[PDB]
Paper text:
TLR7 recognizes pathogenic single-stranded RNAs (ssRNAs) and plays a crucial role in the innate immune response to viral infections, such as human immunodeficiency virus 1 and influenza virus. The activated TLR7 dimer contains two distinct ligand-binding sites. Small-molecule agonists, including imiquimod, guanosine and 2’,3’-cGMP bind to site 1 in the dimerization interface and directly induce the formation of the activated TLR7 dimer, while uridine-containing ssRNAs bind to site 2 and allosterically enhance the binding affinity of site 1 ligands for TLR73,4. Using cryo-electron microscopy (cryo-EM) combined with X-ray crystallography, we reveal that the structural equilibrium between open and closed conformations that underlies TLR7 antagonism.
We have previously reported a series of 8-oxoadenine derivatives (8-OAs) represented by Cpd-1, Cpd-2, and Cpd-3 as specific TLR7 agonists. We confirmed the binding mode of 8-OAs by crystallography. The potent agonist Cpd-3 induced almost complete dimerization under both neutral and acidic conditions. The TLR7/Cpd-3 complex exclusively adopted a closed-form conformation which is in good agreement with the crystal structure. Three agonists Cpd-1, Cpd-2, and Cpd-3 had higher binding energy in the closed form than the open form. Cpd-1, Cpd-2, Cpd-3 and other known TLR7 agonists induce a closed form structure which activates TLR7.
Author numbering:
A (entry chain A), B (entry chain B): 27 to 435, 459 to 475, 490 to 835
Write the structure that this text describes.
């Protein structure tokens, strides 16, 4: 099927449309650029390898290169592996790039470079040197970069990669770079805005530096600028989870009132962590087009009650005023200026970390006529009291977020508090209007709590204290609710009428409600499913369920059930027939996850008792030691079977004789030592087979007939114990010459023996000695 | 040191005191009795093996045998392994035991025997045949057993091991067994008390059977009987987690009022799950000696309010009235008869599962003058209200257990609800008075809640909802408290004055309080430790701690700190110096557990920052990929180092050069392929080394000097990848001939190669071919 075996340890791809030949050698444990890279190669990635030098030899033949990604072949000591520390900085010999006449992008981040590589081609539009040790920019070193448009110089002098001096930039160093659009000098220990900058800039990044003061003419020429970020100059250092040095005298970043006058094109201004106490209106006099403004992590509590600057921002889309609270203060209420009412275009308003006791309807009144408001985020406020019915005046919003509060009767997990949330390394919103009440102190709920909230489509109660015997009378107003997250509560299923009032509920998550399921001889009515007539998906993961008062769960509607991390091993105790039909009457059930249920065996009757339309079944992570494959005959619509992370030692004698329907078979991380003689014979329906991370030594043609193999979308064999004797000749040949996709042929499909070939990739194996 | 190597795959022991020669071959995957068992052998255990027959060959030479334990060499289908099902019942050929003239004990449980083995010696005092398929007892088959004293016949016909008929016992079958003390017929599908039974019985077990009626003369002769168990005849089957058939018409076990009249010696009567509605006083008329009475899992709610029978039990020590609640009733209060006051000797009273709303002081007044009462257990009652101050009238008690209740302002997990709680397979109490409030609905605490409980030594608040910013004012009355379990709450460490009122606190568990540590940019004062002047032990496991407002924890008292399952990897982010002395000022700290903290490496500064008296350090389960062993020089009092379950690939060149103090080194479950040339040279302090579950191939003499080996209490090498070539000659000899204790030389110290010796124990290896 292939005349010449692909032997290069890099994935290769044609996007013939854009004459792109893409060679990806990301993380292949290489110490040399591999031989025999295609001449027509356009994009070459050599990221995360241990290649110690670049020379004219490196790219000699590859003249059609438009991109070289050579990131992290020597990452700074503190950012990189400590088990494989890079010994010495990447060596770049002269004339290494001057050849590459079509080169448009060059990434040399995280290689401990001391200086900007010279002799670069004039075609270059983008050059990235983040996380090197370049902390002085001279005009002379930048002349090569005439046609440059995007320049990343950040992370060259900061706490993870220290240089122990101030960043230095020569006067007018970037001025003659007349096509420069994006300049990033973030995380560099910079002390003044470099001037003069080319007027051609669209984006300027100066955050996480030691800039104390903005000169009034620092941004005078930048009349094309759209994004400016001055964040984390004079940072607010309270509970900073990085080392943090504030400007002395508790001073803020000092910004002349007329500093932004030139920036008529500005769309995004970021002044996060600048220790601001006031926001002068005068800043925003000649910027009417500002859309995104970040004023998070300042000291603007008082200002939020005033905020005259808001009158000048009628086009603003996003406003962030999060974490402005005064240290040592627990305000009684949120004091929002009337000025908020002048934010005609506002779609998103975030004010986390204001920190106040009580939210009352009136206090949100400035927001009442903001027609386009879509998100209100009042998370992490330690609010103790909130009549949720106030949100009746907010039907128009997509999300009301009261997450992480103390109420009782998306973003990255570390978003506001991480150092560089945009650092490069080496959900129920879609159902409609969402009230996120997660991680609060709600211990008791009743119908009136939700009075006037009929419009809600998703309600997130995850992470509360609800410890109550729901009888179908608690959620009565929520006649439109489609999704309920009840995870991390203490559901008590005394009554099978639980949740039945939610007449349109499509998704119910009662995962991690193990409290009442963890105790012996308490009633649990798992048959509560019957009343929920439109329920598509039920999650009851990690409930530690080992007893049930009802013998059968029933739904005419339910399609997916996650039952992971329970104790079906106890319910199906060998000899106890009573629960072998627990899922049988879930008639439309298509997907069942019963992984992590300690099922070391399956009692007979388990497969017979499965509902008749089951398609996707997980029995992963069960410590299964044995498995009657023949019983798969009962599962007449089975498509996907996940037996990953078990202790199976064998496969069936004939898989076609086990199931006619089975497409996707996952057997990874088992103890399988050898295949049956005619394993896959006549199994024409099979499309995906994972046998990775087993202990297979031989694979003969009888077990792996070609007329089954050649229909496989994918076939995983890596991390086995392959013996490369002459007996293995068919398999070695077949691997080397097959079209079928087999991940990790470079990295992890390898001979353990005999002696001679130990550690050697089978892709590379010369077995001519078997043919003399 | 040893002239003749022990090759036998069984532990062997001399207890010279009791002329015992003890050969334990428990679970050695044997298919034959091994050769070369000592002639002087007295106790031979061959439990859990696959030995398919016994014959006169079996025990030929072993005439001094007093005990043969041969349990579970063929366990019934539903009780045993499904990966290694026993094919065929154990075969006992004639005259197999008749030789063994001193044989006093024979255990043949779980071997699928069809009949009572004949030709047994007349010395036999104990015979166990549990979990075979013997369900008809005939007088003739029992004549061999004249001198028998203890006879276990249970579990031969029940749901896990069915026989599909009634158990049958011939009239007077056991009568001529004139020395019989203990007869167990539990779990046998018995239909009537077998009569007549020898008067010589001390203990009779008939529980879990189909006995519907006791005839009034069924126990007439048994005037030496001490224990009687009739439990689970006519069971209460509500929430039963085994298959359960009740007597028709919900009838009870019917017991003539005079059924116990002969039993003047009875000490323990067990009537668990007999569906009793009334407890006739007349039962206890001629039993003044009764000490333990189990009336759990009946229908005795009403009776508890009356209970005239109690007046006849002034010697009773233990009373169990648990799980007597009426189905579908939630009583308002617990109605305890005054009669309880006549239980002069009572030490333990359990009434779980009465199921009531409100507990008031007066309701316990019958118990007020029970001088010897030590334990009151009112767990699993769904109590919503209890003025804890009522327990001021109970300072004499050791434990007050309100575990698993719904209060707000040891025993097996499956104790009352498992089938046979005495089925054979193949804590802060010691501090003083304990109030267990675990798994309740307490969301808020304040001082007055504990008014008049100054006498408490331990308080268990584990598993509540406490979600509050403890400021030192919540526990003020608990002046004597020594132990607090605050695990599985939601501790908010806003204030470093948390817990400071508990001035005599020696142990504080704040484990699994991860809630407020899981959210970003919240204050956490870990330095709260400073105020607790006598605190010996702090547990703050699984708190998912990745940030702290304080840079140092401090204590002059603290000796043990468990910090397992947190994120020190984030606090010690490479480049962040601020938390490297987090434990330094815990001056008396001797033990630190920082396992499960995702520490793939240890930043420099960590060992320098450890407190000066650290003795016992765990870094287990961290995914450590590297380790600077030299840094152990900073830990000048280190005795135990646990590096188990990591990814270390190398040991130090010389361990003596790394620490002078180190006694116990645990390296198990790592990736170590070889030892350094002089690894253990001059390591005179070393006493315990575990190198098990690594990938070691060779061990040369240089690495393992004899003057270090011969001080080792224990040395673990099992589950490595030992190569048994001629190069391995020293190691093989040394293993075979050393005194040093090396567990699993039989089971798991094994050659992987070469070809010839694959799978072979190194203990057994003959390498004379390397000496010709
Ligand atoms: C960012 O730039 C600043 C300064 O522009 C760097 O701070 C400087 O760092 C060095 C070494 O940390 C300090 O020098 C020291 O002086 C003392 C004498 O008191 C001497 O004992 C030391 O051995 C060393 O020579 C220098 O004073 C300090 N300057 C200031 C104003 O703090 C900083 O390290 C740079 N940041 C990064 C992350 O590279
Ligand atoms: C304990 O003993 C009882 C009675 O001594 C056994 O119950 C009996 O079980 C047998 C076998 O299942 C039943 O006979 C069968 O009847 C069905 C009709 O239902 C027939 O089609 C079968 O071919 C067979 O002949 C019998 O119904 C039943 N008797 C009673 C009174 O329930 C029971 O099996 C024993 N339990 C255990 C765990 O050994
Ligand atoms: C191959 O290299 C080219 C050149 O660096 C990449 O082209 C850029 O793609 C980005 C994002 O997809 C565009 O917005 C830029 O405008 C492109 N620049 C130029 C000059 O062409 C291309 O993405 C690379 N592809 C792969 C798969 O590596
Ligand atoms: C002690 O066991 C009784 C079992 O009944 C049981 N199971 C729950 N999950 C229960 N949850 C619960 O509140 N109760 C109290 C109750 C009991 C009866 C009627 N009404 C309320 C619960 N009782
Ligand atoms: C989001 O920033 C809030 C400051 O940190 C913080 N951390 C807790 N664990 C806190 N827990 C808490 O109740 N608050 C609010 C508060 C503040 C001041 C005085 N009393 C209460 C908390 N505030
Ligand atoms: C709200 O804010 C303004 C300005 O900071 C203040 O003067 C006013 O009194 C505040 N009102 C309340 C109720 O806090
Ligand atoms: C509910 O909130 C939790 C915790 O904040 C979050 O992890 C979960 O995804 C949310 N649920 C949905 C359905 O959005
Ligand atoms: C669930 O099972 C119980 C127990 O028999 C029954 O009373 C109840 O009506 C069932 N509930 C539903 C909603 O099907
Ligand atoms: C050895 O057998 C005797 C008689 O059965 C018994 O009393 C003793 O417990 C046994 N000892 C051990 C430790 O096996
Ligand atoms: C308690 O129960 C007994 C028996 O049911 C009844 O006779 C008695 O009157 C009850 N007493 C109280 C105080 O409820
Ligand atoms: C609880 O009883 C105590 C003393 O036994 C009394 O001081 C107190 O008022 C009672 N408290 C409540 C809340 O019932
Ligand atoms: C407190 O109760 C829990 C379970 O209810 C138990 O695991 C724990 O050990 C108890 N605490 C102590 C200190 O014994
Ligand atoms: C601690 O909290 C209690 C109850 O909320 C309060 O009465 C007390 O004064 C607080 N202590 C301090 C120092 O604020
Ligand atoms: C803990 O740290 C804080 C903040 O530095 C300090 O104010 C507080 O008093 C310290 N507490 C103790 C008990 O040392
Ligand atoms: C060391 O600490 C572990 C962790 O609990 C403990 O189990 C072990 O006994 C300790 N050993 C010594 C000798 O201190
Ligand atoms: C380690 O070895 C060298 C040479 O023996 C010696 O100078 C040094 O003091 C040693 N360190 C310790 C802790 O013994």
């Amino acid at each position: 099927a292939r005349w010449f075996p692909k032997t290069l340890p890099c994935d290769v791809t044609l996007d013939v449309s854009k004459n792109h030949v893409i060679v990806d050698c990301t993380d292949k444990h290489l110490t040399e650029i591999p031989g025999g890279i295609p001449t027509n190669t356009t994009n070459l990635t050599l990221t995360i390898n241990h290649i110690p030098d670049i020379s004219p030899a490196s790219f000699h033949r590859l003249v059609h290169l438009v991109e070289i990604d050579f990131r992290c072949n020597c990452v700074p000591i503190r950012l990189g592996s400590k088990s494989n520390m890079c010994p010495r900085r990447l060596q770049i010999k002269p004339r290494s790039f001057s050849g590459l006449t079509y080169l448009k992008s060059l990434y040399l981040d995280g290689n401990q470079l001391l200086e900007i590589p010279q002799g670069l081609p004039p075609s270059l539009q983008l050059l990235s040197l983040e996380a090197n040790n370049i902390f002085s920019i001279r005009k002379e070193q930048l002349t090569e970069l005439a046609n440059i448009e995007i320049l990343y110089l950040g992370q060259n002098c900061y706490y993870r990669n220290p240089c122990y001096v101030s960043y230095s930039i020569e006067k007018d160093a970037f001025l003659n770079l007349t096509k420069l659009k994006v300049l990033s000098l973030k995380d560099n220990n910079v002390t003044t805005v470099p001037t003069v900058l080319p007027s051609t800039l669209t984006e300027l990044y100066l955050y996480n530096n030691m800039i104390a003061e903005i000169q009034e003419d620092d941004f005078n020429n930048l009349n094309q600028l759209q994004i400016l970020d001055l964040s984390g100059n004079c940072p607010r250092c309270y509970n900073a989870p990085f080392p943090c040095t504030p400007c002395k005298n508790n001073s803020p970043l000092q910004i002349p009132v007329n500093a932004f006058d030139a920036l008529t094109e500005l769309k995004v201004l970021r002044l996060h962590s600048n220790s601001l106490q006031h926001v002068p209106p005068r800043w925003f006099k000649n910027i009417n087009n500002l859309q995104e403004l970040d004023l998070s992590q300042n000291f603007l509590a008082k200002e939020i009650g005033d905020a005259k600057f808001l009158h000048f921002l009628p086009n603003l889309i996003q406003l962030d005023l999060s974490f402005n609270f005064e240290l040592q203060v627990y305000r009684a209420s949120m004091n929002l200026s009337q000025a908020f009412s002048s934010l005609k275009s506002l779609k998103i308003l975030r004010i986390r970390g204001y920190v106040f006791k009580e939210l009352k309807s009136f206090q949100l009144s400035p927001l009442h006529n903001l027609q386009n408001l879509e998100v209100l985020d009042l998370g992490t406020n330690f609010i103790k009291i909130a009549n949720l019915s106030m949100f009746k005046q907010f039907k128009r919003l997509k999300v009301i977020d009261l997450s992480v509060n103390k109420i009782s009767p998306v973003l990255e997990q570390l978003y506001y508090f991480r150092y560089d949330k945009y650092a490069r390394s080496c959900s129920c919103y879609k159902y409609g209007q969402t009230l996120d009440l997660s991680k609060n102190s709600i211990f008791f709920i009743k119908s009136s709590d939700f009075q006037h909230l009929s419009f809600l489509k998703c309600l997130n109660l995850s992470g509360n204290l609800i410890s109550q015997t729901l009888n179908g009378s608690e959620f009565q107003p929520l006649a439109e609710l489609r999704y309920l997250d009840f995870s991390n509560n203490r559901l008590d299923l005394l009554h099978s009428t639980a949740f039945e009032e939610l007449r349109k509920l499509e998704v119910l998550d009662i995962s991690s409600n193990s409290h009442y399921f963890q105790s012996e001889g308490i009633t649990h009515m798992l048959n509560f499913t019957k009343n929920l007539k439109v329920l598509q998906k039920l999650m009851m993961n990690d409930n530690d369920i080992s007893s049930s008062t009802s013998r059968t769960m029933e739904s005419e509607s339910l399609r997916t059930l996650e039952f992971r991390g329970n104790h079906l091993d106890v319910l199906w105790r060998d000899g106890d027939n009573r629960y072998l039909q627990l899922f049988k009457n879930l008639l439309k059930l298509e997907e069942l996850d019963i992984s992590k249920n300690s099922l070391s065996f399956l009692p007979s009757g388990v497969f017979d008792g499965m509902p008749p339309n089951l398609k996707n079944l997980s029995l992963a992570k069960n410590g299964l030691k044995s498995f009657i494959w023949e019983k798969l005959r009962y599962l007449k619509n089975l498509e996907t079977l996940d037996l990953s992370h078990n202790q199976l030692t064998t496969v069936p004698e004939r898989l076609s004789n086990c199931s006619r329907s089975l497409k996707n078979l996952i057997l990874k991380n088992n103890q399988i030592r050898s295949l049956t003689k005619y394993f896959l014979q006549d199994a024409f329906q099979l499309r995906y087979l994972d046998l990775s991370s087993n202990k297979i030594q031989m694979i003969q043609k009888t077990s792996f007939p070609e007329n089954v193999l050649n229909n496989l979308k994918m076939l995983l064999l890596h991390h086995n114990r392959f013996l490369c004797t002459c007996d293995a000749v068919w398999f070695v040949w077949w691997v080397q010459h097959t079209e079928v996709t087999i991940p990790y042929l470079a990295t992890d499909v390898t001979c353990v023996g005999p002696g001679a070939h130990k550690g050697q990739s089978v892709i590379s194996l010369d077995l001519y000695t078997c043919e003399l």
